[PDB]
Amino acid sequence: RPQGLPNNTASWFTALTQHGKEDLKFPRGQGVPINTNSSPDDQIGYYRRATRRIRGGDGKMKDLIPRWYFYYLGTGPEAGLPYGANKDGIIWVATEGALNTPKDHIGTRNPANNAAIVLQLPQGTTLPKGFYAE
Ligand SMILES: [Zn+2]
Ligand SMILES: [Zn+2]
C-alpha cells in the first residue's frame, strides 16, 4: 500500500510562547494573526500547544516551555475539529465576519519551501501577560 509524504504540519506563523504562568486566552473577536493576503471570511482558527514526539537523545525533554501555533479552521493537526470543540491544548479564535468553513485554500506551511511569518496581532489586542510571539 504505497504512501506519499505526510501533509505539511507547520503553522504559517511563528510561535506564541508562554514565558509566564498565565493560561492562554483571548476576548471574543481577538486572537487571529495578521495575514494581509487573506479575506475577512478567512479570519478564524485555533492555537494549538506544540506536542512532543521524538526530539530527545540526552534530554528526553525538549523545551519544557509551552509554545502555541495558529492554524486556520479546517487545517493543521486538528483539521477535523469543528469550531469550538473542547480539547486540552486547543484555543479557538475568530474575527468578526469570519466564515465557518475549512480554509484548505490557505492550508499549512511546508518548512522546506517557506519560512514562517512573524505572528502579529492587531493594535490593542488583549494578550495575557507573559505571552510573546517568536
Ligand atoms: Zn521567547
Ligand atoms: Zn482566502
Author numbering: 41 to 174
Question: What does the publication say?
Answer:
One central protein involved in the formation of regulatory ribonucleoprotein complexes (RNP) is the coronaviral structural protein nucleocapsid (N). N plays a major role in RNA genome replication, translation, and packaging and has further been found to interfere with host-integrated stress responses and stress granule formation. The N-NTD possesses a peculiar, hand-like three-dimensional fold, with a β-sheet palm and several flexible loops, arranged as fingers around the central β-sheet. The latter, together with the extraordinarily long basic β-hairpin finger, constitutes the positively charged primary RNA-binding surface.
We have recently reported that mutation of serine 105, located at the interface of the β-hairpin and the N-loop, to isoleucine, results in more sophisticated changes in the NTD RNA-binding behavior. Slightly more distant from the palm region, des_mutant S105I interferes with the ability of NTD to selectively recognize RNA target elements, likely caused by an impaired contact between β-hairpin residue S105 and the N-loop residue Q58. In contrast, the S105 mutation exhibits more local affects, comprising the β-hairpin and the N-loop, in line with the mutation site located outside the core network. Consequently, and different from Q58I, the melting temperature of S105I is not affected, but remains WT-like. To unravel the structural basis of network-disrupting mutations, we solved the 2.2 Å and 2.0 Å crystal structures of Q58I and S105I, respectively. The comparison of our WT structure to Q58I and S105I reveals a strongly deformed β-hairpin (basic finger) for both mutants. This is reflected by high RMSD values of 4.552 Å and 3.198 Å for Q58I and S105I with the WT, respectively. Most importantly, while we find the β-hairpin architecture to be significantly altered in both mutants, the core network remains intact in S105I. This observation fits the WT-like melting temperature observed for S105I. Our crystal structures of Q58I and S105I show a strongly impaired arrangement of the extruding basic finger and a loss of its β-hairpin character. Both mutants lack the capacity to specifically recognize target RNA yet retain the general capacity to bind RNA non-specifically.
